[PDB]
Amino acid sequence: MEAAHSKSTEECLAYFGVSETTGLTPDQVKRHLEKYGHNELPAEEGKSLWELVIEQFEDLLVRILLLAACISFVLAWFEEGEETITAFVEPFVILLILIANAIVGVWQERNAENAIEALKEYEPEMGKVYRADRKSVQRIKARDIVPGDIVEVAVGDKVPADIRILSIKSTTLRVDQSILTGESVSVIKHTEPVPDPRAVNQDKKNMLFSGTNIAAGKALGIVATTGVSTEIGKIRDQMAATEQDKTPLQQKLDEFGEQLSKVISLICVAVWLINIGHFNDPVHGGSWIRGAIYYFKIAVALAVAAIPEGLPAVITTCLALGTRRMAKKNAIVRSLPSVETLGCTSVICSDKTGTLTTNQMSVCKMFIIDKVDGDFCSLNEFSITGSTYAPEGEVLKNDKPIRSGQFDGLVELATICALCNDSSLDFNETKGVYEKVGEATETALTTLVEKMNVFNTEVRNLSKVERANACNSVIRQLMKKEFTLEFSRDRKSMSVYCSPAKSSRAAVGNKMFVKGAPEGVIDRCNYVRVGTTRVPMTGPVKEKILSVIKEWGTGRDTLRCLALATRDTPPKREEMVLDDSSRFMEYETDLTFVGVVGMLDPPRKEVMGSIQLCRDAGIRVIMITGDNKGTAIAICRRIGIFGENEEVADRAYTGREFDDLPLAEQREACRRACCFARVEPSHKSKIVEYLQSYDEITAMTGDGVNDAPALKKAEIGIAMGSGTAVAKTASEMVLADDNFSTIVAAVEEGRAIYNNMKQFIRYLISSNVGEVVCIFLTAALGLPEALIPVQLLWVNLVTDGLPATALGFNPPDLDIMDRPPRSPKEPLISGWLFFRYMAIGGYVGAATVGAAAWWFMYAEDGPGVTYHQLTHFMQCTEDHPHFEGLDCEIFEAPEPMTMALSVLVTIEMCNALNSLSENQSLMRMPPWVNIWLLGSICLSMSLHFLILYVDPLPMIFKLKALDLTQWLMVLKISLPVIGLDEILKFIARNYLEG
Ligand SMILES: C/C=C(/C)C(=O)O[C@H]1C(C)=C2[C@H]([C@@H]1OC(=O)CCCCCCC)[C@@](C)(OC(C)=O)C[C@H](OC(=O)CCC)[C@@]1(O)[C@H]2OC(=O)[C@@]1(C)O
Ligand code: ALF
Ligand SMILES: [Mg+2]
């Protein structure tokens, strides 16, 4: 039934044609069960083991490096016995790394908790219905409940489905709807209709929502909707349909390989144009079948030279280490890719209760009457410190500590708070903290009484377990609570009947202690207590009292206020009719006003500061809460989201108000407003989405089940360490410490990491440039292969793979948190940096090819072959005449190729020092600042030797160690790089900007 909250009890029964007295028939149940399905949230299992892997290859650069791997195997057959000892060493290491990351890849992702699983933990296994099937109530499987069922709920019960309340059995039905509002306070339901068809959950006080629980009372209702058609279902649907977007960095990479596929494809065809001068001459020394082999080989070369493999492993390494670092800072990162995105945050959306606040109601102000005299009435106001349920704190009179026991009014105020209470305190020994037992607004009263210690009870030596209710028990010993007149909706107050301890039932001196909404209570008072005396309530006194209640109830504190009173001469136990509550208000009459207490859920101590720091980093903070607007705005002023006196008419909205604005208005509203109150779960995700429609990287921080959709939606969802499992499993990070401050340090860590990732992302890609310049030259220039695609891999995995990981340790800046969030679009390489790496790029390309063509012409132990007979090195065994000198097997010699690889390596070992800073001369910025980089270059050079000496290696790589005569040469061809880029680093920093 849609909109059951807007209809009457009769209309709802009619709608399904059911009897409140008998319930559905076995037929009706079967028909409904088929028409609506089972009352269950569809389970969503994670991707299978097979999927995870396949998804691994889904990457373009990965599918291009795989295609080349195949062509590298198809042509792995065509080979003779000269090198028949190593023919498939390439098709091996090419797919070895592919399946290496693929496998490991799934070793991180397949390890994740499911949010819907956690969510279904709010689904009860059992429910209670009245089926025509039989007379007494049946207890069946919740999933077997259907719309139209007549259900019964009782205190402690976890509501089975979205139900329209039919009849409330007790005086009141109290419900905890924190899974939908994040507020634990008991909501008092009723059965009357709620007209507005757009009423938010907080407004549907005639409905019971699946997943919530009964705090107190017994009720009968009719099921309106089940399964995914419930409020918890919408939460479930927003979490199912999600799939976090690709981080900003991943997009830059996906863009890179998006072009690499175009550039390479274009370079191949490019070289093709330079191979038309051999197609003309009518020669049969190379058929088409053979003629194609050339291209498929040069292609596999370009691919392995372009695709900067190894990077995917360098990144994962930096992040993994960062995560360990952040964990030390109390920030558990569940999604590595989010670490980078957190530094790029411009807006932080935050839940209020239990996130910005402690979620522990605390009484911080209270007053009693001082003296009365005609139109003059003065109050004794006090303040109480303490923001938790712990009995730690003091009572302040004018900011100066005092003893409550001195004031008689406070002895009575405390007596009422201890007696007119159904809650208590408890010390959780396992957790080492004090926790409430029962309602929060009542435990605040319990806690206040322990702090006041109006009878000066000796408590310093009691165990924390016994300290929890010490002072309350003392008071419970003075008066016996005969019975309590439970709260009534038409009274807004509650009272308890008490007789003196150790007196006869006939004895005189009984009292009623009242607690309630100030208006009603104060109006039933005809007297005001003064110390231990009592004088008549008069217009002046009443106005004095109501004036301060008004200030406290709506100010910069907007506190929940309770008036405490007592009936000095209550009715005789007998003449009281307890079974009829409409008679209670009259019993709670002729009252003596005693005092007022003011409470609120405080903010966490370190939140104002944390938000100021966020502001410094150019990050805005917005509040989105299910709690009411008045207290939401109050808290916003207390933590600095609003000015103590700022006008917020257009800067704060309730969910309902927001829903009224048209779409374009809603959007703009998210840019202007900083406080959204009395919202529903989907309102939070919608706000985050609007924020994202302006291309802002938004973080969401919360602790409730109602925060899940938004947490899921935000680029960076951050859950409170001591919050719900649902929130945690939907987040990218968890603040084990529960401090907002931690978020700030995580953003800082996020900015620093990316800065370092920026360098080694350039370093590696840079290297890959010089490589392609090489393969390009020795492709349209005729020359033999200076470097084979089976060597590059090792270089881009171990040679550069080490300096990279070393760069991820560059010392971060100081002004890191004084600059505004960087744009998601900010490119890695462009402008002068595009050219600077273009020069170094082509350079290495010819720096290697030059060392190869050097071992021939201007060489030593090599044939001084002329450049012409060098480029035509092919025509040797076919054209002996023209081209002739030595043996035709000196080209594929392990010398020329082993001369270019030494250059490439020596260059990149110098380029890693050039990447220690964008526009900074290595001389100005000591290349030894990063000790891990120096030691890194060593391990690479040593491994460059090891890949020569130990024969089992240079065999597959086709390399041969060089001596001083040759090695000294490399140092003089690569070393000049600390100049080109050195001069270039001067240009930008002296002719562009700094
Ligand atoms: C792997 C190696 C290379 C050389 C490659 O093809 O990189 C190109 C390329 C695809 C881009 C370019 C390279 O393009 C050129 O250098 C122009 C053509 C000259 C080649 C001559 C043939 C020998 C990057 C690498 O380099 C330079 C030095 O100019 C910079 C940048 O890349 C980034 O910002 C890094 C993103 C991870 C990208 O223009 C980028 O395309 C984009 O979409 C960007 C925005 O990304
Ligand atoms: F704790 Al909330 F909205 F769920 F402030
Ligand atoms: Mg909360």
Does residue 102 sit in the same domain as residue 145?
Answer: no
Instruction: Calculate how far, in angstroms, residue 684's C-alpha sits from the geometric centre of ligand 2.
Output: 10
Does residue 569 sit in the same domain as residue 470?
Answer: yes
Element (H, E) at 175: strand 174-176
Residue 940 Cβ contacting ligand 2 at under 6 Å: no
401 φ, ψ (degrees, to nearest 5): -55, 135
Does residue 809 sit in the same domain as residue 940?
Answer: yes
| 4 belongs to a structural domain | no
Instruction: Calculate how far, in angstroms, residue 299's C-alpha sits from the geometric centre of ligand 1.
Output: 18
Do residues 856 and 863 touch, judged by C-beta distance below 8 A? yes
d(CA 940, CA 802): 7
| 252 belongs to a structural domain | yes
Query: Would you tell me the crossing angle of helices 681-692 and 663-672 to the nearest 10 degrees?
Result: 80
Helix (H/G/I), strand (E/B), else coil: 243: coil
Do residues 366 and 599 touch, judged by C-beta distance below 8 A? no
Nearest to 472 by CA among 417, 396, 531: 417
Q: What's the Rg (C-alpha) of the chain?
A: 39
The CATH number given to whatever domain includes residue 620 is 3.40.50.1000
307 labeled binding residue:
yes
Task: Kindly list the distances between the CA atom of residue 647 and the CA atoms of 628, 651, 670, 771, in Å, as whole numbers in the listed order.
Answer: 18, 8, 17, 62
The CATH number given to whatever domain includes residue 196 is 2.70.150.10
The CATH number given to whatever domain includes residue 862 is 1.20.1110.10
Do residues 444 and 363 touch, judged by C-beta distance below 8 A? yes
Q: What is the DSSP string of 890-914?
A: STT-TTTHHHHHHHHHHHHHHHHHH
Q: What are the residues whose beta carbons fall under 8 Å from the beta carbon of 377, sequence distance 6 or more?
A: 369, 371, 540, 541, 544, 545
703 labeled binding residue:
yes
DSSP code for 937: H
Do residues 204 and 191 touch, judged by C-beta distance below 8 A? no
Does residue 612 sit in the same domain as residue 560?
Answer: no
Query: Would you tell me the crossing angle of helices 740-780 and 897-914 to the nearest 10 degrees?
Result: 150
d(CA 833, CA 23): 76
Judging by DSSP bridges, how do beta strands 213-216 and 174-176 pair with one another? antiparallel
Does residue 445 sit in the same domain as residue 568?
Answer: yes
| Spacing of C-alpha 44 from chain mean position | 21
Q: How many domains does the chain have?
A: 4
Strand partners, 479: 500
d(CA 627, CA 201): 11
| 913 belongs to a structural domain | yes
Proximal ligand: closest to the CA of 178: 2
What are 803's two structure tokens?
């300096």
Atom of ligand 2 nearest to the CA of 684: 3
d(CA 140, CA 128): 6
Residue 706 Cβ contacting ligand 2 at under 6 Å: yes
Instruction: Calculate how far, in angstroms, residue 911's C-alpha sits from the geometric centre of ligand 3.
Output: 50
Nearest to 205 by CA among 8, 20, 489, 5: 5
Residue 603 Cβ contacting ligand 2 at under 6 Å: no
Helix (H/G/I), strand (E/B), else coil: 802: helix
- Which of 602, 617, 652 is where one domain is finished? 602
Nearest to 165 by CA among 18, 5, 23: 5
Residue 350 Cβ contacting ligand 2 at under 6 Å: no
678 labeled binding residue:
yes
Q: Which residues of 324-339 are buried (b: 16+ CB within 10 A; e: fewer)?
A: eebeeebbbbbbbbbb
Helix (H/G/I), strand (E/B), else coil: 56: helix
Residue 351 Cβ contacting ligand 2 at under 6 Å: yes
Q: Which residues of 591-608 are buried (b: 16+ CB within 10 A; e: fewer)?
A: bbbbbbbbbbbbbbeebe
Instruction: Calculate how far, in angstroms, residue 388's C-alpha sits from the geometric centre of ligand 2.
Output: 18
| 785 belongs to a structural domain | yes
What are 922's two structure tokens?
């290595």
What are 651's two structure tokens?
């800067």
Other C-beta atoms lying within 10 Å of the C-beta of residue 371: 12
Tell me, letter by letter, the H, E, C secondary structure of 833-845. Answer: HHHHHHHHHHHHH
- Which of 240, 274, 292 is where one domain is finished? 240
d(CA 778, CA 846): 9
- Atom 3 in ligand 2: residue holding the nearest Cα: 625
Sign of the CA dihedral running 181, 182, 184, 185: negative
Q: Which domain holds residue 617?
A: 346-358+603-745
351 as an active site residue: the answer is yes
d(CA 808, CA 61): 23
The pick from 181, 184, 633 for probing ligand 2's pocket by mutation, whose C-beta has the most ligand atoms within 8 angstroms, reads 181
Q: What are the residues whose beta carbons fall under 8 Å from the beta carbon of 37, sequence distance 6 or more?
A: 226, 227
- Which of 687, 721, 745 is where one domain is finished? 745
Residue carrying the six token digits 């010392």? 811
| 285 belongs to a structural domain | yes
- Atom 4 in ligand 2: residue holding the nearest Cα: 182
Q: Which residues of 62-90 are buried (b: 16+ CB within 10 A; e: fewer)?
A: bebbeebbebbbebeeeeeeeeeeebeeb
Does residue 520 sit in the same domain as residue 500?
Answer: yes
Element (H, E) at 747: helix 740-780
d(CA 368, CA 351): 36
Helix (H/G/I), strand (E/B), else coil: 759: helix
Q: How was this structure determined?
A: X-ray
Nearest to 476 by CA among 509, 514, 436, 449: 449
Task: Kindly list the distances between the CA atom of residue 919 and the CA atoms of 424, 835, 914, in Å, as whole numbers in the listed order.
Answer: 65, 13, 9
Residue 263 Cβ contacting ligand 1 at under 6 Å: yes
Does residue 725 sit in the same domain as residue 693?
Answer: yes
| 885 belongs to a structural domain | yes
DSSP code for 240: H
Does residue 216 sit in the same domain as residue 259?
Answer: no
Sign of the CA dihedral running 920, 926, 929, 931: positive
Does residue 101 sit in the same domain as residue 47?
Answer: no
Does residue 536 sit in the same domain as residue 391?
Answer: yes
Does residue 586 sit in the same domain as residue 663?
Answer: no
Element (H, E) at 752: helix 740-780
Residue 774 Cβ contacting ligand 1 at under 6 Å: no
Do residues 575 and 583 touch, judged by C-beta distance below 8 A? no
The pick from 259, 754, 768 for probing ligand 1's pocket by mutation, whose C-beta has the most ligand atoms within 8 angstroms, reads 259
Task: Kindly list the distances between the CA atom of residue 149 and the CA atoms of 30, 146, 152, 453, 468, in Å, as whole numbers in the listed order.
Answer: 12, 6, 10, 52, 44
Q: Which residues of 478-489 are buried (b: 16+ CB within 10 A; e: fewer)?
A: ebeeeebbbbbe
Does residue 225 sit in the same domain as residue 271?
Answer: no
848 labeled binding residue:
no
Range list of H helices, 621-737: 629-639, 655-660, 663-672, 681-692, 708-713, 725-729
908 labeled binding residue:
yes
Other C-beta atoms lying within 10 Å of the C-beta of residue 741: 18
What are 838's two structure tokens?
């273009």
Residue 655 Cβ contacting ligand 2 at under 6 Å: no
Burial class (CB in 10 A: 0-12, 13-18, 19+), 154: middle
Do residues 870 and 857 touch, judged by C-beta distance below 8 A? yes
Other C-beta atoms lying within 10 Å of the C-beta of residue 503: 12
799 labeled binding residue:
yes
463 φ, ψ (degrees, to nearest 5): -70, 155
d(CA 412, CA 596): 11
Q: What is the DSSP string of 57-88?
A: H-SHHHHHHHHHHHHHHHTSSS--SSSTTSSS
Check 157, 351, 601, 707 and give the catalytic one. Answer: 351
Range list of H helices, 569-660: 584-587, 607-616, 629-639, 655-660
Query: Would you tell me the crossing angle of helices 90-109 and 60-74 to the nearest 10 degrees?
Result: 150
| 1 belongs to a structural domain | no
d(CA 325, CA 337): 15
What are 592's two structure tokens?
């003596």
Q: What is the resolution of this structure in A?
A: 2.5
Residues 414, 432, 383: CA angle, nearest 5 degrees: 30
What are 412's two structure tokens?
């009575």
The CATH number given to whatever domain includes residue 540 is 3.40.1110.10
Amino acid at residue number 948: L
| 595 belongs to a structural domain | yes
Burial class (CB in 10 A: 0-12, 13-18, 19+), 111: exposed
d(CA 71, CA 894): 24
